Design a protein around this ligand. Structure first.
Ligand SMILES: NCCNc1ccc(NCCN)c2c1C(=O)c1c(O)ccc(O)c1C2=O
Length: 273
């Protein structure tokens, strides 16, 4: 019922997460994305309500796929003998933040503020549904170029949210917090805030702040680009070396630099049309 119900198109990308293709639902022509994951490469399984043995990503996507938000929704999934196949929303036209930043360089603050806010709403939404993404970064964010709406995408290093320590990590090194580098332990929220700090610097400087472990552990931020006596404060706060010194989501969103965010539509009008 799978190769009948959807019509495959060009490969969107591939890497550690598997292979994703552009697709159309035949039922009606909904653009979709078709994600193939191989059973051999899934380190980490879960189980649905009705109690079947699935990749965690599916658990996590199912928990966050209710209602609207800034998360790309699991429409359906299939099992095959050696692979699981996931069908996801596909905005049209779309561009991931990595390519966007790669093309246009450092982002004007107003646009960064709008993007950053929407990520924060998306991650709040996830933390709310009991899900922790664990790999928030430019290439896990899609931009709907028309609506100016950001969407989070790759839940395959994700985990159920919990208040005790984590001692496994699969996201990107350069995005990992110092407490992971030094101790191989972190807590969810504060590790997410650190990665959000990395993300924001990226947005406003066109590039990530830290390359090597020693830089992360030293946690000292140099700005290669002009950036406001404010955006630099928020960034450094999120990148505090001690987890307990980082802000909560609430504090990030009440920070002066986060005031007067544009709505997504006016964001696209001004900055993407
Ligand atoms: N700029 C081209 C972006 N291509 C992707 C690369 C990796 C990738 N996987 C995770 C990145 N690490 C995805 C995509 C998608 O375009 C995409 C999409 O257009 C709609 C829905 C999607 O889920 C993806 C998606 O998961």
């Amino acid at each position: 019922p799978l190769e009948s119900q959807y019509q495959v198109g060009p490969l969107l990308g591939s890497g550690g997460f598997g292979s994703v293709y552009s697709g159309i639902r035949v039922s009606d022509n909904l653009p979709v994305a078709i994600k193939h994951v191989e059973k051999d490469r899934i380190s980490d399984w879960g189980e649905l309500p009705n109690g079947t043995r699935v990749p965690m990503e599916v658990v996590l996507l199912k928990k966050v796929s209710s209602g609207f938000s800034g998360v790309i929704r699991l429409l359906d999934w299939f099992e095959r003998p050696d692979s699981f196949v996931l069908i996801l929303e596909r905005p049209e036209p779309v561009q991931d933040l990595f390519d966007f930043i790669t093309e246009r360089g450092a982002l004007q603050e107003e646009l960064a503020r709008s993007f950053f806010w929407q990520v924060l709403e998306a991650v709040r939404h996830c933390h709310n549904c009991g899900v922790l993404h664990r790999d928030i970064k430019d290439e896990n964010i899609l931009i709907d170029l028309n609506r100016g709406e950001l969407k989070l995408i790759d839940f395959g290093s994700g985990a159920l949210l919990k208040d005790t320590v984590y001692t496994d990590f699969d996201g990107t090194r350069v995005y990992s917090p110092p407490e992971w580098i030094r101790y191989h332990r972190y807590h969810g929220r504060s590790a997410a805030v650190w990665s959000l700090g990395i993300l924001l610097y990226d947005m406003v400087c066109g590039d990530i702040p830290f390359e090597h472990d020693e830089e992360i552990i030293r946690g000292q931020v140099f700005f290669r680009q002009r950036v406001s006596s404010e955006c630099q404060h928020l960034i450094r706060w999120c990148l505090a070396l001690r987890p307990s010194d980082r802000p909560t989501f609430e504090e990030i969103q009440n920070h002066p630099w986060m005031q007067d965010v544009l709505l997504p539509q006016e964001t696209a009008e001004i900055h993407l049309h």
